[PDB]
Paper text:
Laccases are enzymes that belong to the family of multicopper oxidases (MCOs) and catalyze the oxidation of a phenolic and non-phenolic substrate to the reduction of a molecule of oxygen to form two water molecules. These enzymes have four catalytic coppers, a type 1 copper (CuT1), close to the surface, and a trinuclear center (TNC) formed by one type 2 copper (CuT2) and two type 3 coppers (CuT3). The Tth-Lac is the only laccase that presents a β-hairpin (Ala292–Gln307) close to the substrate binding site and the CuT1 site. The hairpin comprises two antiparallel β-strands (β22 and β23) and a connecting loop of six residues.
The deletion of P1Tth-Lac extends from Met295 to His303 with an additional A304G mutation. The protein crystal from the P1Tth-Lac mutant laccase is distinct from those reported for wild-type Tth-Laccase. The final model at 1.6 Å resolution shows acceptable refinement and stereochemical statistics. The majority of mainchain atoms have close superposition with the greatest deviation localized to residues M293 to P312. The region with the most structural discrepancy corresponds to the sequence (G304-P312) immediately downstream of the nine deleted residues of the β-hairpin (M295-H303). As would be expected, the shortening of the β-hairpin sequence resulted in the loss of antiparallel beta-strands and the flexible β-loop that covers the substrate channel. It appears to have destabilized these residues (Q307, G308, P309, S310) and their polar contacts normally present in Tth-Lac. Higher B-factors of the residues downstream of the deletion indicate increased flexibility (Q307, G308, P309, S310) that were otherwise more ordered in the Tth-Lac structure. P1Tth-Lac shows no significant changes in the residues that coordinate the CuT1 site (His393, Cys445, His450, and Met455), nor in the residues proposed to bind the ABTS substrate (Tyr288, Tyr232, Arg290, Met355, Asp390, Met 391, Met354, Lys424). It shows the coordination of all four Cu atoms by their coordinating residues, and they align well with the Tth-Lac structure, suggesting there was no disruption of the tertiary structure or the active center.
Residue numbers in the entry: 26 to 295, 305 to 462
Write the structure that this text describes.
């Protein structure tokens, strides 16, 4: 039985659910531990909705500390997905929103109490949200075997998620248990020859340079929607908070390694030197006499956007020795508004990494089209909400401003966000 979160689906246009955030004893990777969970599980339940559904999610805070919930990737109003809300211990809050028309893909939910994200997310508070689309009914997709792979690492101390050290605040915290759906090196015994894998990097800081032995991956969706047609890749880098959806065509019986290949993201300090080995994430067993489906020739059209009216430059910097991080020379201040834009305009954001470490840049509320990174034209058209920048790279993003209100942009190495790498955008 392949480990995968339980699914809660909308019905009759509504997903109404109470989720408790609570310390939960679990058995994990052959040991006993108490994690912080939504819905009593790690990961939390997958919420599956359709465009136009209403979601009404009551978060009950049964932690000893305040918390809140963020709907990562969902283009909903910041008046609902409010990064400044704090739910005190013992209290509840109801999030209510409508799923946008034409939205599709894998999204996720996690805590977002500013300055206090990294320990909550590391402790196990996360889960996926899938938006089903009409495109999922085409033969080439409908007949695939679908799985969600939540890629999230963990370290334990004293049977609880390990506390943050000073080095953790600088690099972001990685764990030694590199888990898939909360399991250590599970085996997926495929029953069908085409797999549709939804991939979520819900780690604090760990990157996953994914490859499947002997199989290309056919990328069909990025963070925030479908590509226009499948893109064959040999490997796929998922930075923290990124998602993707891929098709895998099992052409031959066998036992295949899905691995996270070595990737140097510019971490510094005390660490083993000498090269890193690939980390096996899962074993994939192909069925007898597999006959895969043909690929879809087309997926969904990417919209032509208006010409942009303004260009913004956001510069990321570091003070690695203080573990403080900055956008345009300042640390986040919840009282300050850094950027002001108009609703129903398009902007170009040039995000420039002037540090030594990779930084995966994220913008709430307003999905963007990546035009280029590092001067290189992006290989597909799809909505994204996280983009990785290596040292010295500039990413050029086309940002349609939709929903009014104040929201945030930040690095999704969540320790960096907590240590200052976040700013505030107001759309009016
Ligand atoms: Cu009914
Ligand atoms: Cu997020
Ligand atoms: Cu977000
Ligand atoms: Cu960062
Ligand atoms: Cu955020």
């Amino acid at each position: 039985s392949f480990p995968e979160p339980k699914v809660v689906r909308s019905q009759g246009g509504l997903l109404s659910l109470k989720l408790s955030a609570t310390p939960t004893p679990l058995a994990l990777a052959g040991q006993r531990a108490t994690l912080l969970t939504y819905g009593g599980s790690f990961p939390g339940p997958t919420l599956r909705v359709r465009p136009r559904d209403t979601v009404r999610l009551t978060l009950e805070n049964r932690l000893p500390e305040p918390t809140n919930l963020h709907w990562h990737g969902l283009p909903i109003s910041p008046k609902v997905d409010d990064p400044f809300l704090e739910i005190p211990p013992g209290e509840s809050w109801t999030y209510e929103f409508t799923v946008p028309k034409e939205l599709a893909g894998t999204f996720w939910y996690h805590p977002h109490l500013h300055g206090r994200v990294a320990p909550q997310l590391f402790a196990g508070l996360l889960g996926a949200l899938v938006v089903e689309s009409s495109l999922d009914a085409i033969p080439e997709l409908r007949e695939a075997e679908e799985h969600l792979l939540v890629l999230k690492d963990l370290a334990l101390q004293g049977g609880r998620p390990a506390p943050h050290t000073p080095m953790d605040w600088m690099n972001g915290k990685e764990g030694d248990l590199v888990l898939v759906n909360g399991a250590l090196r599970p085996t997926l015994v495929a029953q069908k020859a085409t797999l549709r894998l939804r991939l979520l990097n819900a780690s604090n800081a760990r990157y996953y340079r994914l490859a499947l032995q002997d199989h290309p991956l056919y990328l069909i969706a990025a963070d925030g929607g479908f590509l226009e047609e499948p893109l064959e890749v040999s490997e796929l880098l998922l930075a923290p908070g990124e998602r993707a959806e891929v098709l895998v065509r099992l052409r031959k019986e066998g036992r295949f390694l899905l691995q996270a290949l070595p990737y140097d993201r510019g971490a510094m300090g005390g660490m083993p030197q000498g090269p890193s080995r690939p980390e096996t994430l899962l074993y994939l067993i192909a069925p007898k006499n597999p006959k895969p489906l043909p690929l879809p020739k087309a997926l969904s059209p990417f919209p032509t956007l208006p010409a942009p009216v303004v260009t913004r430059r956001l510069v990321l910097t570091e003070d690695m020795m203080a573990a403080r991080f900055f956008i345009n020379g300042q640390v986040f201040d919840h009282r300050r508004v850094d950027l002001k834009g108009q609703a129903q305009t398009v902007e170009v954001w040039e995000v420039e990494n002037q540090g030594d470490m990779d930084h995966p840049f994220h913008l709430h509320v307003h999905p963007f089209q990546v035009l280029s990174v590092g001067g290189r034209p992006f290989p597909y058209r799809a909505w994204k909400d996280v983009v990785n920048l290596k040292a010295g790279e500039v990413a050029r993003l086309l940002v349609p401003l939709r929903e009014k209100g104040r929201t945030v942009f930040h690095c999704h190495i969540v320790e960096h966000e907590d240590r200052g790498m976040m700013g505030v955008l107001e759309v009016g």
